[PDB]
Amino acid sequence: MELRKGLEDIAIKETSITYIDGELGRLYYRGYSIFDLASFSNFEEVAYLLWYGKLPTRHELDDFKSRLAEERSISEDISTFVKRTAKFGNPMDILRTTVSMMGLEDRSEGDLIGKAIKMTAKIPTIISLIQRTRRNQEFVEPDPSLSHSENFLYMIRGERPSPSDTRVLDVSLMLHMDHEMNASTMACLVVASTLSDIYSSVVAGISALKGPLHGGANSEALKQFMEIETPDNVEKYVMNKLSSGQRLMGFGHRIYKTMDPRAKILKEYANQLSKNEEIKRLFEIANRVEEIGIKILGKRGIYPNVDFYSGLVFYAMGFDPDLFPTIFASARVIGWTAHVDEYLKDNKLIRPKAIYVGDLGKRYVPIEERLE
Amino acid sequence: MELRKGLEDIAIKETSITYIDGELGRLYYRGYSIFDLASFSNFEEVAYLLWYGKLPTRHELDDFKSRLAEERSISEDISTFVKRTAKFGNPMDILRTTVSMMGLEDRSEGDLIGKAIKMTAKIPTIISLIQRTRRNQEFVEPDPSLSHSENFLYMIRGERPSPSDTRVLDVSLMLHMDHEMNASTMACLVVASTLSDIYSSVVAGISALKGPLHGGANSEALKQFMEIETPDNVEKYVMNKLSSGQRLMGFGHRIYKTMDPRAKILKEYANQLSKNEEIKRLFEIANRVEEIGIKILGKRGIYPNVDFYSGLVFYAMGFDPDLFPTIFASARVIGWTAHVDEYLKDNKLIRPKAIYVGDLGKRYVPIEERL
Numbered sequence: 001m002e003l004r005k006g007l008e009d010i011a012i013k014e015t016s017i018t019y020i021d022g023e024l025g026r027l028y029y030r031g032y033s034i035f036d037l038a039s040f041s042n043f044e045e046v047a048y049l050l051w052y053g054k055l056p057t058r059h060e061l062d063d064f065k066s067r068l069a070e071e072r073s074i075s076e077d078i079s080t081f082v083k084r085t086a087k088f089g090n091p092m093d094i095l096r097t098t099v100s101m102m103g104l105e106d107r108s109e110g111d112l113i114g115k116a117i118k119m120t121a122k123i124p125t126i127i128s129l130i131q132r133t134r135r136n137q138e139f140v141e142p143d144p145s146l147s148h149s150e151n152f153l154y155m156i157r158g159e160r161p162s163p164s165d166t167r168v169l170d171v172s173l174m175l176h177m178d179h180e181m182n183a184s185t186m187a188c189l190v191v192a193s194t195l196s197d198i199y200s201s202v203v204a205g206i207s208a209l210k211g212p213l214h215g216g217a218n219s220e221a222l223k224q225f226m227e228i229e230t231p232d233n234v235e236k237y238v239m240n241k242l243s244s245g246q247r248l249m250g251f252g253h254r255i256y257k258t259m260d261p262r263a264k265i266l267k268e269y270a271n272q273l274s275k276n277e278e279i280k281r282l283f284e285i286a287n288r289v290e291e292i293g294i295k296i297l298g299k300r301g302i303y304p305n306v307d308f309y310s311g312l313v314f315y316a317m318g319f320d321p322d323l324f325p326t327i328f329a330s331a332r333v334i335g336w337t338a339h340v341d342e343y344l345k346d347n348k349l350i351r352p353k354a355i356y357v358g359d360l361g362k363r364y365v366p367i368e369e370r371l372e
Numbered sequence: 373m374e375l376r377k378g379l380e381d382i383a384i385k386e387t388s389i390t391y392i393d394g395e396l397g398r399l400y401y402r403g404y405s406i407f408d409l410a411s412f413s414n415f416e417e418v419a420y421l422l423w424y425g426k427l428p429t430r431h432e433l434d435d436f437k438s439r440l441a442e443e444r445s446i447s448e449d450i451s452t453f454v455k456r457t458a459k460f461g462n463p464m465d466i467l468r469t470t471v472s473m474m475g476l477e478d479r480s481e482g483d484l485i486g487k488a489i490k491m492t493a494k495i496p497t498i499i500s501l502i503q504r505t506r507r508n509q510e511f512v513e514p515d516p517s518l519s520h521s522e523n524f525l526y527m528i529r530g531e532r533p534s535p536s537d538t539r540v541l542d543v544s545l546m547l548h549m550d551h552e553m554n555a556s557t558m559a560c561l562v563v564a565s566t567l568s569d570i571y572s573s574v575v576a577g578i579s580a581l582k583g584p585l586h587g588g589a590n591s592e593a594l595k596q597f598m599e600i601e602t603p604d605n606v607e608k609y610v611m612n613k614l615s616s617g618q619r620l621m622g623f624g625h626r627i628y629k630t631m632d633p634r635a636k637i638l639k640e641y642a643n644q645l646s647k648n649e650e651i652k653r654l655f656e657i658a659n660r661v662e663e664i665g666i667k668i669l670g671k672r673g674i675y676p677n678v679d680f681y682s683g684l685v686f687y688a689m690g691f692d693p694d695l696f697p698t699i700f701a702s703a704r705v706i707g708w709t710a711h712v713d714e715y716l717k718d719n720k721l722i723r724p725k726a727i728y729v730g731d732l733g734k735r736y737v738p739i740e741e742r743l
């Protein structure tokens with residue numbers, strides 16, 4: 001029988017959650033254009049749409065925003081664990097462990113969406129505590145009067161952010177909430193398919209998202225912009241990379257044959273950030289890298305993906321680069337839990353096989369008869 | 373493209389680790405019959421075989437046994453977490469968390485098999501601490517002079533086991549070390565395919581193994597023997613279960629269309645367990661349920677699986693029934709990590725598709741216009 005390794009040409013579910021148009025560079029959440037959501041929506045409204053399948057009324061959104069805000073606090077045992085590990089732990093290992101501890105401590109049955117709301121609310125608190133602890137700063141408690149993105153920036157900086165900063169983060173999070181099928185969604189679904197709990201599913205999603213191949217989930221492009229150091233070095237660096245058969249970071253995608261619509265929106269909204277000398281210089285480098293990259297690689301359907309600008313935007317708003325994968329998980333958890341919820345409406349155990357290519361019927365020999 | 377919901381009969385890798393013959397009821401690890409390994413081998417020698425692909429020499433096995441014995445200790449952070457949660461937490465949630473903590477505490481690069489050795493050595497220390505804490509008993513530290521299975525029972529009981537009890541645990545663990553492809557192996561491989569670390573892979577395996585649909589990692593057959601209560605009540609209990617649309621627990625397999633060879637080996641080795649009155653009774657019940665269940669369900673290719681006897685065997689050696697899935701994982705981590713190691717020799721990112729059946733091109737309706 002045929003080996004289908006990678007599963008690239010196999011669908012494992014029907015979905016109404018996300019639609020990717022790789023041809024035209026379009027992305028839809030439940031039929032709504034990502035462009036319109038970036039323009040007019042906000043984190044809580046899109047989270048509501050992804051989980052409940054419709055845009056909320058004024059009343060539904062006010063109640064929903066309150067629910068999220070009163071779930072933001074974390075248990076003292078989780079908070080102590082983060083404080084203890086923040087300086088030396090891989091932050092994805094910290095986040096993986098704390099979501100595992102959340103599930104251990106929540107024994108209550110069913111309520112998949114209630115549990116997803118709890119993880120979504122608490123992950124920014126955990127990330128903020130890692131960042132603060134790393135800088136020898138005291139924990140800033142969540143403020144239940146602030147909206148999700150506003151509160152996120154408050155917990156990192158210890159001061160209420162400008163509405164323009166809130167908007168850029170709010171948009172960046174909306175852009176990472178779902179992207180249909182990929183290794184991390186597949187890990188959540190394989191675990192859900194056994195009727196394991198939703199915390200187990202998310203822990204598996206975080207385990208997969210951590211890997212460097214996952215796509216989208218890194219700060220390599222930003223590292224590259226820092227290596228280049230000056231705008232005038234862009235050409236020398238990019239040519240010496242490509243000619244040397246090396247890769248331009250933040251370029252390429254398995255689906256978009258064009259500019260990633262998420263990269264396009266991040267580049268536009270990145271203009272609202274006030275930039276010191278360092279950030280101004282890094283954005284000038286990124287824009288030149290973008291131009292020469294598209295000139296050489298665009299022919300072959302190799303274009304900026306979301307991670308070309310995402311790392312630099314998060315860095316610009318005051319996040320350490322090695323937290324970027326955790327910030328990705330804080331958004332994508334909505335997509336993961338939405339996909340599990342949809343799958344479980346008609347559950348099927350995911351139970352593939354393997355092709356055997358070894359030996360059979362070998363004769364067991366005791367250890368005294370094994371030579372050398 | 374093709375919708376293959378459940379990936380039934382989709383092959384996702386090539387393997388030389390494990391072969392299952394569902395028609396004849398046979399199983400092989402690296403070409404060796406499970407019957408021969410159960411007759412003549414031991415936990416460390418089979419772990420060596422699964423990881424390194426051949427039977428070790430005396431020198432290779434002495435070194436490997438040391439490497440395993442030297443890694444059994446757990447961090448103060450892990451032992452304190454286990455002690456805090458042993459009486460309250462789901463034991464698979466505790467294991468999931470403590471393997472996650474192992475990963476966090478090990479920031480070394482590469483050495484997949486070294487990290488597999490660390491997880492395989494430490495998991496029994498965690499299981500034993502859960503069990504001891506539940507019984508208001510003091511932690512028993514691993515003894516590096518004892519073999520894996522000897523140590524395991526020592527950490528549970530606080531006294532060195534008999535060689536007969538050691539052999540039964542040794543065989544029972546070997547029988548769970550690998551079973552080719554299933555949801556837990558698949559969860560491990562999906563995570564490994566991104567080049568995430570081997571602890572991340574195993575955390576995902578444990579997360580999948582916890583689910584009641586996984587197969588093999590449950591105590592439902594033992595619970596059913598305990599509900600039956602007397603050997604005389606077997607015919608009536610089973611006939612009334614099967615006539616009311618319910619299942620005989622520990623019967624049925626997606627692959628074996630005969631007696632699971634792991635069930636046949638556990639039944640034979642269970643004879644060497646010295647049994648108190650309860651365990652004698654439960655085994656009499658189990659042997660009658662087997663006889664009866666084969667009579668009724670056999671013609672339909674429904675036979676005992678490994679989990680018909682496994683829960684009862686682990687219970688008879690002094691483990692609480694609800695630790696059984698952790699014990700399953702303590703052996704199966706060898707298979708998982710061996711499968712990951714094999715896969716990564718020619719890695720391919722696992723990135724399936726979905727069929728979109730939803731709405732497209734909807735107008736964003738401003739909130740003041742909604743219902």
Ligand SMILES: O=C([O-])CC(=O)C(=O)O
Pocket residue numbers: 178179181182214215216254255
């Ligand atoms: O889906 C992918 O290929 C990876 C990705 O871009 C994402 O997770 O957003």
Ligand SMILES: O=C([O-])CC(=O)C(=O)O
Pocket residue numbers: 550551553554586587588626678
């Ligand atoms: O493989 C399966 O189908 C379940 C099982 O029996 C095992 O994992 O040992």
